[PDB]
Every structure is written in structure tokens, then in C-alpha cells.
Amino acid sequence: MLQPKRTKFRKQMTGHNRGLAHRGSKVSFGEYALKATSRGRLTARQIESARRALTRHVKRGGKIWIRVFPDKPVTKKPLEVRMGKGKGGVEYWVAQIQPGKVLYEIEGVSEELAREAFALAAAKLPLATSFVKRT
Amino acid sequence: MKVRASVKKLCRNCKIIRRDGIVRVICSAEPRHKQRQG
Amino acid sequence: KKIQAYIKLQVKAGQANPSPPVGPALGQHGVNIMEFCKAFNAKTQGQEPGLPTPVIITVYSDRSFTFETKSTPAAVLLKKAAGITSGSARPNSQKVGTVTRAQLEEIAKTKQADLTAADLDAAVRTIAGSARSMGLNVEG
Amino acid sequence: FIVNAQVRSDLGKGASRRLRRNAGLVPAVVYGGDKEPQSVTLELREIAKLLENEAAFSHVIALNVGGVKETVLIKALQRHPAKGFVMHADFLRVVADHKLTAHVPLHFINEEVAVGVKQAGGEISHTISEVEVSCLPKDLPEFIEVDMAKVELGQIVHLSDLKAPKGVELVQLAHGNDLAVANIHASR
Amino acid sequence: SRVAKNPVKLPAGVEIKLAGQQLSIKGAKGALELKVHPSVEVIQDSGELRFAARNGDQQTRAMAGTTRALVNNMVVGVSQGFERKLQLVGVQAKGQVLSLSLGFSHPVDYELPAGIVAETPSQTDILIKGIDKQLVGQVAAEIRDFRPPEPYKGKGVRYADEVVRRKEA
RNA sequence: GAUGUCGGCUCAUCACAUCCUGGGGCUGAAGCCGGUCCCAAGGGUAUGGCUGUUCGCCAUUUAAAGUGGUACGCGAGCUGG
RNA sequence: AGGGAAACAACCCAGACCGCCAGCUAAGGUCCCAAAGUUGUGGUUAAGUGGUAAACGAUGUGGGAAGGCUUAGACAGCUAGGAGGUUGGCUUAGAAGCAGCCACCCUUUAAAGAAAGCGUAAUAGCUCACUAGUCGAGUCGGCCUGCGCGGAAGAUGUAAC
Numbered sequence: 001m002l003q004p005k006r007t008k009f010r011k012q013m014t015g016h017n018r019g020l021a022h023r024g025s026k027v028s029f030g031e032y033a034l035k036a037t038s039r040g041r042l043t044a045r046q047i048e049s050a051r052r053a054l055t056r057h058v059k060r061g062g063k064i065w066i067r068v069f070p071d072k073p074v075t076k077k078p079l080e081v082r083m084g085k086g087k088g089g090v091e092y093w094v095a096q097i098q099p100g101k102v103l104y105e106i107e108g109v110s111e112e113l114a115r116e117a118f119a120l121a122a123a124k125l126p127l128a129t130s131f132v133k134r135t
Numbered sequence: 136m137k138v139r140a141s142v143k144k145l146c147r148n149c150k151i152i153r154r155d156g157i158v159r160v161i162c163s164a165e166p167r168h169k170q171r172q173g
Numbered sequence: 174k175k176i177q178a179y180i181k182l183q184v185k186a187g188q189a190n191p192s193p194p195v196g197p198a199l200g201q202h203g204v205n206i207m208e209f210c211k212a213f214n215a216k217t218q219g220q221e222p223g224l225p226t227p228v229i230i231t232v233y234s235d236r237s238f239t240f241e242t243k244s245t246p247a248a249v250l251l252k253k254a255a256g257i258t259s260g261s262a263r264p265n266s267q268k269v270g271t272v273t274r275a276q277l278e279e280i281a282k283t284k285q286a287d288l289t290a291a292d293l294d295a296a297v298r299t300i301a302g303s304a305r306s307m308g309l310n311v312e313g
Numbered sequence: 314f315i316v317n318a319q320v321r322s323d324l325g326k327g328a329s330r331r332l333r334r335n336a337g338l339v340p341a342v343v344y345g346g347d348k349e350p351q352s353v354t355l356e357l358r359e360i361a362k363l364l365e366n367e368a369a370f371s372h373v374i375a376l377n378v379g380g381v382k383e384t385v386l387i388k389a390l391q392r393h394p395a396k397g398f399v400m401h402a403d404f405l406r407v408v409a410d411h412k413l414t415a416h417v418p419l420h421f422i423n424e425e426v427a428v429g430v431k432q433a434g435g436e437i438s439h440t441i442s443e444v445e446v447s448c449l450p451k452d453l454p455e456f457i458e459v460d461m462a463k464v465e466l467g468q469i470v471h472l473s474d475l476k477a478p479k480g481v482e483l484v485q486l487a488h489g490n491d492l493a494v495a496n497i498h499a500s501r
Numbered sequence: 502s503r504v505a506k507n508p509v510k511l512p513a514g515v516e517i518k519l520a521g522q523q524l525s526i527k528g529a530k531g532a533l534e535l536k537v538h539p540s541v542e543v544i545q546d547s548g549e550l551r552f553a554a555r556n557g558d559q560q561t562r563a564m565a566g567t568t569r570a571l572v573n574n575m576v577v578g579v580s581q582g583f584e585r586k587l588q589l590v591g592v593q594a595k596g597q598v599l600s601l602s603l604g605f606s607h608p609v610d611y612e613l614p615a616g617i618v619a620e621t622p623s624q625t626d627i628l629i630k631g632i633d634k635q636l637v638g639q640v641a642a643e644i645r646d647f648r649p650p651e652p653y654k655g656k657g658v659r660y661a662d663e664v665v666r667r668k669e670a
Numbered sequence: 671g672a673u674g675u676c677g678g679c680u681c682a683u684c685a686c687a688u689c690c691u692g693g694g695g696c697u698g699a700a701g702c703c704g705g706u707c708c709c710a711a712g713g714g715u716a717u718g719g720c721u722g723u724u725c726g727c728c729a730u731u732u733a734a735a736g737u738g739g740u741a742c743g744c745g746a747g748c749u750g751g
Numbered sequence: 752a753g754g755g756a757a758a759c760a761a762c763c764c765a766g767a768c769c770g771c772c773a774g775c776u777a778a779g780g781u782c783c784c785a786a787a788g789u790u791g792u793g794g795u796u797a798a799g800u801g802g803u804a805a806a807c808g809a810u811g812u813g814g815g816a817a818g819g820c821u822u823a824g825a826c827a828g829c830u831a832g833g834a835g836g837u838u839g840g841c842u843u844a845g846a847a848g849c850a851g852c853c854a855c856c857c858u859u860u861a862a863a864g865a866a867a868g869c870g871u872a873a874u875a876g877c878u879c880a881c882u883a884g885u886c887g888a889g890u891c892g893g894c895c896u897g898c899g900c901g902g903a904a905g906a907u908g909u910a911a912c
Contacts, residue, residue, distance in 0.1 A: 020394045020395055021394050021395070022394050025394040025395075029440075031439075035395075035397075036395075037395050037396070060500075061436050061500045061501060062436075062501075063436075063438060099394070099395035100393075100394030100395040107438065107439065108436055108437075108438070123807095126806085128806095132397060134442070135364075135392075136694090136695050136696070136707075136708065137695085137696070137707075137708095138707065138708060139808080139902090140806090140807070140808065140901075140902040141807060141808040141809090141902085142808065142809075142901095143808075143809095146869085147868095147869090147878090147879085148869080148878090151809065151810075152810095153809075153810080153811070153900085156798090156811095156900070156901080157900095157901075158808070158809045158900080158901060163664075164869060165666070165869085166666065166695080166696065166697095167696055167697070169695080169696075171695090171707095171708075172808095172901060172902080173807090173808045173809070173901065173902075174824080174825085174881080174883075174885085175881065175883085175885090176825080176826080176827090176880080176881065177827090177878090177879060177880080177881075178864090178879045178880040178881070179848095179866095179868085179878065179879030179880090180832075180833095180863095180879080180880090180881075181832095181833090181848095181877055181878080181879095182832065182833035183833065183876095183877090184832090184833045185833090186833085186834050186835095187834070187835090189831090189832090189833070193875080193876095194875055194876090195833090195875080195876065195877090196875095196876075198831095198832075198833085198876090198877085199830085199831065199832065200829070200830075201828090201829060201830085201832095202829090202830075202831060202832060202881095203829070203830035203831075203884085203885060204830085204831035204832070204883085204884080204885095205830090205831060205884090206831065207831095208831065209831075209832085209833080212835095212859065212860085213835090213859090214859060215835080215858090215859035216835050216858070216859055217835060217836095218835075218836065219835045219836055219858080220834060220835040220836060220837095220858075221834075221835080221836055221837060222834075222835070222836085223834090224834090224837090225833090226833095226834065226847090227832095227833050227834075228832090228833060228834055228862080228863070229832095229833080229863055229864070230832060230833065230862060230863060230881090231832095231862055231863050231880095231881050231882060231883085232831080232832070232862070232881065232882085232883050232884095233861055233862065233881095233882055233883045233884090234861085234883050234884045235861035235862090235882095235883090236861080237860075237861060238859080238860065238861080238862075239858095239859095239860040239861045239862045239882095240834090240835080240858040240859060240860050240862075241856095241858065241860085241862070241863070242856075242857060242858070243856075243857080243858065243863085244834090244835075244836095244857065244858055245839095245856080245857095245865055246834065246835095246836095246837095246839095246865085247839085247847090247848090247864090247865035247866090248847065248848060248865085248866090249847055249848085250837080250839085250847070251837095251838095251839065251840090251846095251847045251865090252845085252846070252847055252874090253838055253846090253847095254838070254839095254840065254842060254843090254846070255838075255842055255843045255846095256838055256843070257838095257842090257843065257844085257845065257846090258845080258874085259844090259845045259846095259873070259874055260845065260846080260847080260873040260874050261845070261846050261847095261850090261873060262845065262846095262872065262873055263872045263873075264846095264849050264850065264872095264873095265849075265850045266850080266872080267845090267846095267850090267872095268850070268851095269842095269845095269846095270842050270843095270845090270846055270850090271841070271842065272840090272841065272842050272846065272850090273840085273841050273842095273852080274840055274841080275840070275841035275842095276840060276841070277839075277840045278840095279837085279838085279839090279840085280837070280838095280839045280840065281839090281840090283836080283839095284839095285857070286857095287856075287857045288856050288857055288865090289855085289856075289865075290855070290856085291855085291856095295855090298853080298854070299839095299853095299854065299855090299865065300839070300840060300865090301840095301852095301853070301854080302853035302854035302865085303839065303840070303853085303854075303865055304839080304840070304846085304847070304865085305850085305852085305853055305854080306847090306848080306849060306850075306853080306854095306866085307846060307847075307848095307849070307850070307873095308842090308846040308850050309840085309842080309846060309850070309852095310850070310851075310852040310853075311840085311852065311853070312851095312852045313841075313852090358815095358816060358817090361816095362817085365817095396895090398895095502887085502888070502889085502890095559812085651700095652699095653699085653700050654700070668697090668698095668699085668700095668872095669700090669872060670698085670699080670700055
């Protein structure tokens with residue numbers, strides 16, 4: 001998975017996920033990209049699962065940019081646990097996703113192979129995504 | 136028949152038909168690509 | 174007009190008179206009889222006569238026969254490698270024959286690098302990728 | 314390159330949202346260092362066909378508001394971040410004596426004949442297109458040639474390593490920022 | 502192009518009855534073909550027969566085409582004897598009933614209605630003759646489900662074509 | 671200012687995500703067998719040794735010994751291990 | 752409190768001083784239970800959607816933008832198709848256009864892929880671009896959007912208008 005090397009604190013708040021993704025919406029490194037069109041939450045093994053789908057469906061070369069980064073820690077109360085005995089401990093990591101956030105980018109492939117590779121990538125992600133080219 | 140929630144044309148001989156409100160697939164080659172609803 | 178591909182040609186080469194290796198093939202295209210068999214005039218001794226290997230043809234109605242810039246027969250002439258003639262039983266399944274690209278200087282007299290590729294090392298890739306799809310491959 | 318324009322005597326948020334959802338239009342402005350700015354409505358369908366062109370942004374665009382016609386360079390563009398379509402267009406006046414910075418694409422001409430590709434196994438990595446320039450409107454590069462033919466494996470082409478066509482000032486070279494244009498490197 | 506604007510081109514030996522709402526086709530080698538032609542349909546006359554719709558629907562666009570097809574095989578069945586050659590194992594044709602012992606302990610007897618007729622031109626074969634292709638194909642299907650084609654060795658009653666999926670174990 | 675447990679007995683009632691029986695499709699289904707998936711709830715759907723057992727493990731049967739809801743059905747019906 | 756949301760402290764409208772067999776409105780409504788439009792104009796929708804719902808899957812249908820294939824006669828359907836060395840490759844009952852291990856232009860001159868794969872688990876049969884004489888033409892592939900269709904199985908009785 002992708003995790004930070006160390007963070008300043010261990011628990012964040014829950015927070016909210018509002019707005020559109022104005023920053024992070026351009027294909028800034030690659031030629032083709034997998035942009036999200038709905039807001040949600042990618043859990044760093046969704047991210048790695050779609051990553052492996054991409055890097056396994058290319059088979060020949062290319063360069064894949066993984067743009068999202070899970071830096072938000074998410075906790076959990078275990079089972080048979082009464083509520084309110086301090087905040088529960090960290091389990092996994094999460095990138096907060098807004099509509100427009102470019103998730104993955106590729107160059108070095110054809111447009112058809114890129115499109116049917118981001119189809120494999122989008123099959124593993126709980127978001128509504130789309131396919132964009134460089135403007 | 137093969138009941139899914141996603142029928143597709145598995146080969147080139149497959150052919151998608153709306154029959155009686157059901158999205159079926161008929162294959163003129165292999166009856167294992169016959170599939171019922173989706 | 175008539176529009177389709179993966180057209181399927183096989184007869185004994187040169188003479189179209191023996192029919193029942195195929196027999197009544199057509200009944201869709203609609204051309205005449207007098208229009209294949211006058212261009213047997215100039216050149217033998219180059220491109221493997223008689224054995225069933227097809228031209229895969231396109232048609233026009235000018236009738237003064239036309240040959241391409243092409244001397245590569247490539248479809249139905251390459252089962253035998255040791256001298257035995259028939260075909261493979263079922264693909265990928267019956268592993269009994271051990272096969273790579275070893276002995277080629279018998280044919281590498283006339284490699285003919287013009288109609289294969291851009292240079293000679295890519296002509297190694299063509300013979301490294303020629304017959305490799307019913308029971309052989311190339312590492313060596 | 315010609316787009317048709319209008320007058321736009323009504324400005325704001327809900328006004329702009331009504332232009333986009335009811336009238337099918339797109340707001341814009343025209344401005345230069347020599348005249349007042351002027352707000353303009355355009356059509357989304359009529360500017361989205363310009364944006365289809367590869368030489369859209371590095372080119373003279375005639376622009377007709379009434380019977381008044383202006384020469385116009387598109388120097389800004391706003392775009393809906395999720396769906397992706399033009400909101401307000403934000404373009405610039407063009408005068409014949411003016412410095413006129415625009416973005417020009419890179420075009421990466423002969424990549425099959427690359428000595429880090431054919432003999433040595435490697436792939437071309439374009440890190441940058443859309444170079445910003447600084448040029449009079451007389452010389453507008455619709456493209457900038459990037460020759461990638463005599464470049465070996467592991468070698469990098471920078472902004473100094475290519476051509477500035479007939480008085481075109483590449484902006485980052487005028488600083489100490491010699492950016493990496495393209496790249497030839499080993500595969501994965 | 503679309504098929505309802507393709508005219509019928511009936512021969513001289515099809516003496517039709519225009520009635521305004523339903524067509525009634527008579528002739529030699531079979532006759533008495535009546536069809537209640539639907540409301541969204543036009544039946545006009547010339548030296549040949551032809552069809553057109555009435556209103557801008559996608560439902561009648563299928564109906565004019567099927568009405569041309571129904572009268573096409575109706576006319577050409579009033580003219581010619583619609584056939585089928587079903588190949589089977591063992592056929593003792595005797596009369597208006599058919600007798601066949603398809604691998605069971607009982608020979609299942611199949612009777613033939615008015616219209617259709619079955620013959621015994623060979624040892625393993627049935628030729629059918631009828632005036633509408635509807636009932637010809639229906640009685641061919643009614644023979645066919647007595648014993649469908651087993652793939653492995655190959656038994657049962659077939660059609661005239663050979664597209665039967667065969668497998669080996 | 672009381673809605674008295676688990677199990678067994680007795681009596682049930684519904685669902686269907688069907689255990690048998692019935693009808694099919696595909697098959698890597700030659701046939702006896704199967705595997706899986708549809709359709710179907712009409713009727714059926716063990717006796718025991720151990721332990722308080724539910725369960726479980728065995729023994730022997732059956733065409734089969736289905737899965738669940740009903741105050742984990744049922745003590746103003748019984749028991750009380 | 753009253754009216755509406757079937758029933759429903761807290762939701763909507765509205766704050767009951769008392770009487771009236773007077774009127775006008777709010778929310779919500781106007782086919783019958785049940786008071787008021789079986790009102791008008793233009794559409795959409797065939798699921799009883801309305802009147803339960805997600806990933807995803809569908810020639811369901813309405814609308815609006817665009818491309819090229821568009822009569823020198825297109826998208827599926829009838830009257831030739833079919834080579835000028837050689838055994839073009841570690842294999843020896845049998846390794847051509849689907850094995851662990853891959854693929855781009857020199858003929859006699861109007862003709863065309865050393866193959867994206869179903870055949871007689873394989874040989875001797877045969878479905879995909881046609882530089883055309885031939886039937887005579889208006890159709891094919893994606894985007895945005897309206898409403899719909901499957902995905903959708905439970906227990907006393909229709910039983911989520």
C-alpha cells in the first residue's frame with residue numbers, strides 16, 4: 001500500500017469531502033488519464049489494485065503516474081466494544097477524492113490500449129471515473 | 136443458459152436480443168455462450 | 174458491389190482444372206471462365222510450382238494479367254520440416270515435439286531481405302516468428 | 314480562425330450560470346494593454362470546435378463582436394474540472410508591436426528513427442509539451458519542431474538543445490531554467 | 502433497403518380477392534389463403550401487388566414488412582409446394598398418419614392435419630409438401646422434438662442442413 | 671406496582687436461498703454416474719449409543735434425512751436434566 | 752389545538768376569546784371512496800415505471816451537437832476467385848492462417864495480409880478489407896442529455912399508490 005513515511009499526528013478528524021477538484025484535474029505528466037467524475041474515497045489497496053491492473057495490462061512499456069496519495073488515516077472500533085472509551089486506533093489509509101481528480105496517468109501506449117487499461121483500472125475502484133486526454 | 140447481471144457478446148457469432156423484456160444472447164456457434172439476462 | 178474479407182483461397186497451383194480438391198466453391202462473386210490462364214509464358218524456376226499455396230486476390234476486369242512486386246509464398250506450404258506431411262492433432266495439447274530455430278542456412282542462401290523487413294537483424298526476427306503457432310516457437 | 318461574439322451587459326454568478334444552463338452560451342472577456350476590457354458571450358458549441366484544433370491556442374483568431382472585428386489570442390482558458398468543457402474563455406488583444414506570450418505545443422517529429430530506440434532498447438518519454446514563448450504576432454509558431462532523431466539511449470534533450478524559429482524567445486531559457494523536454498530511457 | 506416497398510410480383514396464376522381490410526388469396530396447387538390484414542396497412546393493386554404503411558410509427562414499420570413477407574410466402578406457396586427434407590432413422594409412411602420408431606420401445610405415430618402431406622422417397626428421409634410455410638415449418642418442428650439430435654454418436658431427426666454441434670469424449 | 675431461561679415432549683404455521691420427487695439448459699454430459707445454473711413450495715423429509723444438551727461425534731437406515739422466520743414458535747399445554 | 756403529509760409529540764401550512772347552515776385563502780389538492788378540472792396547449796413515458804435500489808449490462812425509446820463512409824454506384828444477402836525455388840527453420844505414427852519461447856513489403860504486369868482466429872480433437876470441404884463487369888442505392892460507428900429495462904430473493908394475507 002501507499003502510506004506516509006511518518007505523519008505529524010496519528011488520528012485525524014472525520015471531516016468532509018466537498019467541492020470540485022480544481023487542483024489535480026489536468027493531465028500534467030502523461031498523455032492519457034483516469035479522471036474521477038464522482039466524489040468518494042480510495043483506500044490504498046483499491047489504489048494498489050488498480051495500479052497492478054494497469055501495470056499488468058500494459059505488458060510492453062509505458063510510464064504510469066499514480067497521482068492520488070492516501071494521507072488521511074482512518075480508525076476503527078473493534079467488535080464487542082462499548083462506544084466512547086477514547087478514539088479507536090488506525091487501520092488503513094485513504095485519499096479523499098473529488099469530482100475531477102486525475103487518479104492515474106499514462107504515456108507511451110496507444111490510445112486504445114490506454115483506454116482498455118483504464119477500463120481494468122476503473123473496474124477495481126468504487127468511484128465513477130472517465131477517460132481524458134491531454135489538452 | 137447462463138444467468139448473469141451482465142451479458143456480453145463473448146465471440147463474434149454472439150448476438151444480443153431483447154426477447155419478452157429479457158436481454159438474452161444467442162450464439163450460432165457455441166451454445167455455452169448462450170446467456171440469459173443482464 | 175461485393176464487400177468482404179478473410180477470403181479463403183486454396184487450389185492446386187497453376188492449373189485451375191482439378192476442381193474436387195475443393196469442387197463447387199463459389200456461387201457469390203460472378204466472374205467468367207476465360208480470365209485466369211494465359212500468363213504462363215515467361216518465368217519458371219523461382220517460386221515453388223504446383224504445390225497448393227494461394228494468391229489471395231483482388232479482382233478487376235481489364236484482362237492483361239498483372240503481377241505484384243512480390244515473391245513470398247507464405248500460407249499452405251510449411252507443414253513438413255523433416256519430411257512428414259500431415260497436420261497437428263489438437264493445438265497446445267500434445268507436447269511430444271521439441272522445436273526451435275536451428276538449421277536455416279539451407280534457406281538462408283537467398284534470405285531476400287528486400288521483401289521481408291528493413292534490415293538483416295529484423296530478418297532474423299521474421300524467421301524467429303514465421304511458423305510459430307501450432308506447436309513450435311523460437312528461442313534456440 | 315473566426316468566432317462570433319456578443320456584448321454581455323450583465324455580469325455575475327447567477328447570470329453566468331444562467332448563460333451556461335439556459336442560453337447555452339459561454340462568458341468571456343477581451344482585454345489588452347491598450348484598451349478597456351470588454352465582457353463577451355460566446356457559444357459553447359462554437360468555441361469547442363476551435364478547441365478541437367491542435368493549433369488553436371498559438372494562432373491569430375479573428376473575433377467579431379458586432380460589426381467590429383478584433384484580432385484575438387486565447388490567453389487563458391477555464392474548464393469544468395469534472396465533466397470538461399469550456400467555461401469562460403478569457404482571451405487577449407493582439408497588436409503588431411507587442412511582446413505577446415503564448416503557449417505553443419511540441420511536436421516530436423521522427424521518433425521511429427531514434428538511435429536509442431532501434432539499436433538500443435529504449436522508449437521516448439515526453440516530459441513536456443506546450444512550451445511558452447515570447448514573440449511578435451508576425452511569427453506565431455503553430456508548432457515547434459523537436460527533432461528526436463540523433464539522440465542516443467540515456468540522453469536527454471533540454472530547452473537549449475532545440476531550435477527557436479526566427480525570433481521566438483523561449484521563456485524559461487531567458488531564466489536559468491533549462492527544462493527537460495524529452496527523454497530516452499530503458500524500458501520496464 | 503426496406504422490404505415493404507418491395508412489390509410482391511405475383512404470377513398470373515394467383516387470382517386474389519381485394520376486400521378492403523383483409524386479403525384472400527386463391528390459386529392452383531393450393532388455395533383458400535385468407536389473412537386478416539391489420540389496420541395499419543395499405544393493400545393496393547396494379548399488375549403486381551405492393552404494400553405501404555399508414556402512419557408514422559415504429560410499430561407499423563415492422564408490420565408492413567411482415568405483411569409483405571406473409572403475402573410473399575403466401576403467394577409463392579399458392580404457386581409452389583413448400584418443402585422440407587427431414588432426415589431421421591426409420592420411416593414407415595402409410596397414409597395421413599406417420600409412423601416412426603425413434604429408438605424407443607414404442608413407435609410414436611404422428612398424424613398430419615389438413616393441408617400438409619408427408620412422403621417416403623427414401624429409407625431414412627421425409628419430404629414434406631404444404632401450401633403455407635407456417636404449417637410446413639411447424640410440422641417439421643413437431644417431428645423434430647420427437648427426438649432432438651444427440652451430439653456424440655449422432656442420433657435423432659435432423660434438418661436438411663448440417664450445422665449440428667458434434668462433440669467427442 | 672414482574673414480558674418466568676436452555677433443552678426435550680406435544681402441536682404446529684409460513685418463506686424459499688429445493689434435501690427428495692417433477693421440468694429444463696450448458697458441460698471438460700459415450701452410458702451408470704455427475705458438476706453447475708434456471709423453473710417449481712404439491713406431498714414427503716430417520717431410529718439409536720454418548721452428553722442436560724442445542725450442536726457435534728459415531729452406529730445403522732432412507733428417495734431424502736433441506737435451510738430459515740414464528741417472544742432464538744410453543745411451561746394460564748407437560749417436563750425440569 | 753386546527754389543516755396537510757393514509758394512520759404519524761418534534762415535518763409542511765398556520766398560532767384556537769366566544770357564537771354563525773356567510774365569504775376568501777395557505778400548505779396540500781381537484782376520476783370514485785372524498786370537497787374541488789375526467790380543465791386547456793405542447794411533449795415524454797408501455798414499466799403499472801409512477802407506486803422501493805447500487806456497481807455494472809442492454810439495436811428500449813425521445814432530443815441535440817459532430818466526423819467519415821455517402822450513385823465514378825456504400826452497410827448484410829446471388830452469376831470466376833485461387834503462384835513464377837524449397838523438405839522458409841533443434842522436430843524424424845502427425846508440428847501451414849490458434850504450443851513454455853513471435854511476427855511490415857524485389858513477379859511475366861490491370862491483381863492482394865511470411866495472419867486479430869471456428870473447421871473433417873488434424874489432412875480433401877470453409878465465415879473477415881475486395882484496384883471490379885453485375886441487383887440500385889441513403890445508411891453505418893461513438894459523445895451529451897430526458898424518460899424507461901434487467902441487476903431485484905422471506906417468512907400470518909394482496910401487503911412499498
